[PDB]
From Swiss-Prot, chains A, B:
Pfam family, one: Levi_coat
Source organism superkingdom: Viruses
GO cellular component, one term: T=3 icosahedral viral capsid
Region (Viral RNA-binding): 31-104
Gene Ontology biological-process entries: negative regulation of viral translation; regulation of translation
Keyword terms, alphabetized: Capsid protein, RNA-binding, T=3 icosahedral capsid protein, Translation regulation, Virion
Task of the protein: Capsid protein self-assembles to form an icosahedral capsid with a T=3 symmetry, about 26 nm in diameter, and consisting of 89 capsid proteins dimers (178 capsid proteins). Involved in viral genome encapsidation through the interaction between a capsid protein dimer and the multiple packaging signals present in the RNA genome. The capsid also contains 1 copy of the A2 maturation protein. Acts as a translational repressor of viral replicase synthesis late in infection. This latter function is the result of capsid protein interaction with an RNA hairpin which contains the replicase ribosome-binding site.
Listed name of the protein: Capsid protein
Gene Ontology molecular-function annotations: identical protein binding; RNA binding; structural molecule activity
Amino acid sequence: ASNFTQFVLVDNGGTGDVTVAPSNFANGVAEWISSNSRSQAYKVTCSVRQSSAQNRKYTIKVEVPKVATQTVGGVELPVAARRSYLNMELTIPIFATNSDCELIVKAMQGLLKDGNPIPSAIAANSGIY
Amino acid sequence: ASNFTQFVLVDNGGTGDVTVAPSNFANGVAEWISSNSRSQAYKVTCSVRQSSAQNRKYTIKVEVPKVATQTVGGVELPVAARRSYLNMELTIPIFATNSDCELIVKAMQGLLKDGNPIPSAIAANSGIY
Protein backbone atom coordinates (compact mmCIF):
# COMPACT_ATOMS: atom_id res chain seq x y z
CA ALA A 1 0.00 0.00 0.00
CA SER A 2 2.53 2.73 0.98
CA ASN A 3 5.04 3.21 3.88
CA PHE A 4 6.70 6.25 5.45
CA THR A 5 9.26 3.76 6.56
CA GLN A 6 13.00 3.37 6.46
CA PHE A 7 14.43 1.89 3.29
CA VAL A 8 17.74 1.08 1.67
CA LEU A 9 18.43 3.70 -0.92
CA VAL A 10 21.86 2.27 -1.94
CA ASP A 11 22.55 -1.44 -1.51
CA ASN A 12 26.32 -2.01 -1.47
CA GLY A 13 25.85 -5.68 -0.64
CA GLY A 14 26.74 -5.51 3.06
CA THR A 15 26.21 -3.43 6.16
CA GLY A 16 27.67 -0.41 4.23
CA ASP A 17 24.26 0.29 2.55
CA VAL A 18 22.80 3.81 2.38
CA THR A 19 19.45 3.90 4.25
CA VAL A 20 16.98 6.85 4.38
CA ALA A 21 14.56 7.29 7.32
CA PRO A 22 11.24 9.20 7.64
CA SER A 23 12.28 12.77 8.54
CA ASN A 24 9.27 14.93 7.84
CA PHE A 25 5.76 15.11 6.65
CA ALA A 26 5.56 18.73 5.51
CA ASN A 27 2.28 19.20 3.60
CA GLY A 28 1.37 16.21 1.50
CA VAL A 29 5.15 15.95 1.18
CA ALA A 30 6.71 12.93 2.83
CA GLU A 31 10.48 13.22 3.29
CA TRP A 32 13.22 10.66 3.96
CA ILE A 33 16.84 11.54 4.90
CA SER A 34 20.09 9.59 5.70
CA SER A 35 22.90 10.32 8.34
CA ASN A 36 22.40 13.75 6.95
CA SER A 37 24.57 16.51 5.67
CA ARG A 38 28.32 16.05 6.29
CA SER A 39 29.64 14.79 2.95
CA GLN A 40 26.32 13.10 3.40
CA ALA A 41 22.64 13.79 3.16
CA TYR A 42 20.82 11.47 0.76
CA LYS A 43 17.34 13.04 0.60
CA VAL A 44 14.11 11.55 -0.86
CA THR A 45 10.78 13.41 -1.21
CA CYS A 46 7.43 11.94 -2.31
CA SER A 47 4.11 13.69 -2.79
CA VAL A 48 0.84 12.66 -4.43
CA ARG A 49 -1.93 14.72 -5.97
CA GLN A 50 -4.85 14.66 -8.26
CA SER A 51 -3.66 16.67 -11.25
CA SER A 52 -6.36 17.62 -13.86
CA ALA A 53 -8.28 14.90 -12.04
CA GLN A 54 -8.77 12.06 -14.50
CA ASN A 55 -5.29 11.49 -13.06
CA ARG A 56 -3.21 11.27 -9.95
CA LYS A 57 0.41 12.50 -10.03
CA TYR A 58 3.29 11.19 -7.96
CA THR A 59 6.19 13.68 -7.65
CA ILE A 60 9.43 12.07 -6.43
CA LYS A 61 12.67 14.00 -5.78
CA VAL A 62 16.03 12.35 -4.89
CA GLU A 63 19.15 14.30 -3.85
CA VAL A 64 22.51 12.24 -4.09
CA PRO A 65 25.39 13.79 -2.05
CA LYS A 66 27.56 12.46 -4.84
CA VAL A 67 30.59 10.43 -3.48
CA ALA A 68 31.68 13.75 -4.85
CA THR A 69 32.79 16.75 -2.83
CA GLN A 70 35.65 16.79 -0.32
CA THR A 71 36.69 13.34 -1.56
CA VAL A 72 39.15 14.99 -3.93
CA GLY A 73 41.24 18.11 -3.51
CA GLY A 74 41.50 21.25 -1.40
CA VAL A 75 38.19 22.81 -0.36
CA GLU A 76 38.28 21.46 3.18
CA LEU A 77 34.72 22.23 4.22
CA PRO A 78 32.23 21.35 1.48
CA VAL A 79 28.65 22.65 1.23
CA ALA A 80 26.26 22.26 -1.71
CA ALA A 81 28.59 19.46 -2.63
CA ARG A 82 27.53 19.67 -6.24
CA ARG A 83 25.16 16.81 -5.81
CA SER A 84 22.78 15.50 -8.45
CA TYR A 85 19.01 15.45 -8.26
CA LEU A 86 16.21 13.58 -9.80
CA ASN A 87 12.77 15.01 -10.23
CA MET A 88 10.40 12.25 -11.28
CA GLU A 89 6.77 12.82 -12.22
CA LEU A 90 4.38 9.91 -12.78
CA THR A 91 0.84 10.53 -13.96
CA ILE A 92 -1.51 7.57 -13.58
CA PRO A 93 -5.27 7.39 -14.36
CA ILE A 94 -7.32 7.81 -11.13
CA PHE A 95 -8.88 4.33 -11.15
CA ALA A 96 -5.94 2.45 -12.75
CA THR A 97 -6.31 -1.15 -11.34
CA ASN A 98 -3.28 -2.60 -9.37
CA SER A 99 -2.32 -4.70 -12.36
CA ASP A 100 -2.09 -1.38 -14.23
CA CYS A 101 -0.13 -0.12 -11.26
CA GLU A 102 2.13 -3.20 -11.08
CA LEU A 103 2.92 -3.01 -14.74
CA ILE A 104 4.17 0.60 -14.16
CA VAL A 105 6.72 -0.22 -11.41
CA LYS A 106 8.02 -3.02 -13.65
CA ALA A 107 8.46 -0.81 -16.77
CA MET A 108 10.29 1.51 -14.28
CA GLN A 109 12.49 -1.14 -12.68
CA GLY A 110 13.11 -2.26 -16.27
CA LEU A 111 14.19 1.18 -17.66
CA LEU A 112 16.87 1.17 -14.99
CA LYS A 113 18.31 -2.31 -14.87
CA ASP A 114 22.10 -2.65 -14.69
CA GLY A 115 23.34 -3.36 -18.24
CA ASN A 116 20.56 -1.47 -19.97
CA PRO A 117 21.09 1.51 -22.22
CA ILE A 118 19.75 4.40 -20.10
CA PRO A 119 21.51 3.45 -16.86
CA SER A 120 24.66 2.51 -18.95
CA ALA A 121 24.65 6.03 -20.45
CA ILE A 122 24.07 7.70 -17.07
CA ALA A 123 26.77 5.81 -15.34
CA ALA A 124 29.48 6.74 -17.91
CA ASN A 125 28.12 10.30 -17.83
CA SER A 126 27.47 9.89 -21.64
CA GLY A 127 24.91 10.25 -24.44
CA ILE A 128 22.75 7.41 -26.02
CA TYR A 129 24.15 7.79 -29.55
CA ALA B 1 28.60 4.00 -22.15
CA SER B 2 25.14 4.27 -23.80
CA ASN B 3 23.14 2.13 -26.33
CA PHE B 4 20.30 2.89 -28.74
CA THR B 5 19.66 -0.79 -28.48
CA GLN B 6 16.76 -3.07 -27.78
CA PHE B 7 15.99 -3.72 -24.13
CA VAL B 8 13.49 -5.50 -21.94
CA LEU B 9 11.17 -2.92 -20.51
CA VAL B 10 8.98 -5.46 -18.61
CA ASP B 11 10.48 -8.75 -17.48
CA ASN B 12 7.66 -11.25 -16.84
CA GLY B 13 10.15 -14.04 -16.23
CA GLY B 14 9.77 -15.84 -19.57
CA THR B 15 9.46 -15.21 -23.28
CA GLY B 16 6.36 -13.00 -22.51
CA ASP B 17 8.61 -9.97 -21.65
CA VAL B 18 7.88 -6.49 -23.04
CA THR B 19 10.84 -5.33 -25.19
CA VAL B 20 11.31 -1.85 -26.75
CA ALA B 21 13.44 -1.34 -29.90
CA PRO B 22 15.19 1.76 -31.33
CA SER B 23 12.49 3.51 -33.42
CA ASN B 24 13.73 7.02 -33.98
CA PHE B 25 16.40 9.52 -33.39
CA ALA B 26 14.46 12.77 -33.78
CA ASN B 27 16.70 15.64 -32.61
CA GLY B 28 18.83 14.73 -29.64
CA VAL B 29 15.79 12.60 -28.79
CA ALA B 30 16.34 8.87 -28.94
CA GLU B 31 13.11 6.85 -29.02
CA TRP B 32 12.31 3.20 -28.30
CA ILE B 33 8.94 1.52 -29.06
CA SER B 34 7.39 -2.01 -28.65
CA SER B 35 4.98 -4.01 -31.00
CA ASN B 36 3.36 -0.66 -31.12
CA SER B 37 -0.09 0.71 -30.76
CA ARG B 38 -2.88 -1.91 -30.69
CA SER B 39 -3.70 -2.27 -26.99
CA GLN B 40 0.03 -1.90 -27.15
CA ALA B 41 2.68 0.71 -27.65
CA TYR B 42 5.16 0.91 -24.77
CA LYS B 43 7.18 4.03 -25.65
CA VAL B 44 10.50 5.24 -24.14
CA THR B 45 12.21 8.58 -24.94
CA CYS B 46 15.66 9.74 -23.77
CA SER B 47 17.41 13.03 -24.41
CA VAL B 48 20.48 14.68 -22.91
CA ARG B 49 21.47 18.31 -22.64
CA GLN B 50 23.65 20.74 -20.87
CA SER B 51 21.21 22.75 -18.77
CA SER B 52 22.62 25.94 -17.09
CA ALA B 53 25.92 24.25 -17.93
CA GLN B 54 27.57 23.37 -14.64
CA ASN B 55 25.16 20.49 -15.31
CA ARG B 56 23.93 17.98 -17.82
CA LYS B 57 20.24 16.96 -17.79
CA TYR B 58 18.82 13.62 -18.82
CA THR B 59 15.10 13.78 -19.71
CA ILE B 60 13.43 10.34 -19.81
CA LYS B 61 9.77 9.76 -20.76
CA VAL B 62 7.98 6.36 -20.53
CA GLU B 63 4.45 5.70 -21.86
CA VAL B 64 2.75 2.44 -20.44
CA PRO B 65 -0.23 1.24 -22.55
CA LYS B 66 -1.65 0.15 -19.23
CA VAL B 67 -2.89 -3.54 -19.31
CA ALA B 68 -5.77 -1.13 -19.21
CA THR B 69 -8.08 -0.28 -22.09
CA GLN B 70 -10.17 -2.78 -24.05
CA THR B 71 -9.31 -5.43 -21.46
CA VAL B 72 -12.53 -4.63 -19.63
CA GLY B 73 -15.92 -3.61 -20.97
CA GLY B 74 -17.58 -2.23 -24.08
CA VAL B 75 -15.57 0.33 -26.05
CA GLU B 76 -14.47 -2.09 -28.74
CA LEU B 77 -11.81 0.01 -30.42
CA PRO B 78 -9.59 1.77 -27.88
CA VAL B 79 -7.36 4.78 -28.59
CA ALA B 80 -5.52 6.94 -26.04
CA ALA B 81 -6.04 3.94 -23.83
CA ARG B 82 -5.71 6.07 -20.75
CA ARG B 83 -2.14 5.07 -20.32
CA SER B 84 0.23 6.41 -17.68
CA TYR B 85 3.41 8.35 -18.29
CA LEU B 86 6.57 9.08 -16.50
CA ASN B 87 8.59 12.19 -17.08
CA MET B 88 11.94 11.83 -15.33
CA GLU B 89 14.53 14.59 -15.14
CA LEU B 90 18.03 13.95 -13.78
CA THR B 91 20.49 16.79 -13.37
CA ILE B 92 24.10 15.72 -12.86
CA PRO B 93 27.22 17.93 -12.53
CA ILE B 94 29.08 18.11 -15.89
CA PHE B 95 32.27 16.37 -14.71
CA ALA B 96 30.66 14.00 -12.17
CA THR B 97 33.09 10.98 -12.10
CA ASN B 98 31.61 7.48 -12.97
CA SER B 99 31.59 6.56 -9.31
CA ASP B 100 29.36 9.63 -8.86
CA CYS B 101 27.41 8.35 -11.83
CA GLU B 102 27.24 4.76 -10.52
CA LEU B 103 26.03 5.89 -7.16
CA ILE B 104 23.10 7.67 -8.94
CA VAL B 105 21.76 4.60 -10.83
CA LYS B 106 21.94 2.68 -7.53
CA ALA B 107 19.99 5.30 -5.49
CA MET B 108 17.51 5.06 -8.44
CA GLN B 109 17.31 1.27 -8.61
CA GLY B 110 16.97 1.49 -4.82
CA LEU B 111 14.04 4.00 -4.75
CA LEU B 112 12.14 1.51 -6.86
CA LYS B 113 12.85 -1.92 -5.45
CA ASP B 114 9.91 -4.30 -5.02
CA GLY B 115 8.84 -4.13 -1.35
CA ASN B 116 9.91 -0.53 -0.84
CA PRO B 117 7.58 2.27 0.12
CA ILE B 118 7.38 4.32 -3.10
CA PRO B 119 6.82 1.40 -5.48
CA SER B 120 4.47 -0.20 -2.82
CA ALA B 121 2.38 3.01 -2.81
CA ILE B 122 2.36 3.26 -6.62
CA ALA B 123 1.36 -0.30 -7.14
CA ALA B 124 -1.71 -0.08 -4.83
CA ASN B 125 -2.51 3.28 -6.45
CA SER B 126 -2.20 4.80 -2.89
CA GLY B 127 -0.62 7.55 -0.78
CA ILE B 128 2.53 7.23 1.51
CA TYR B 129 0.74 8.12 4.76
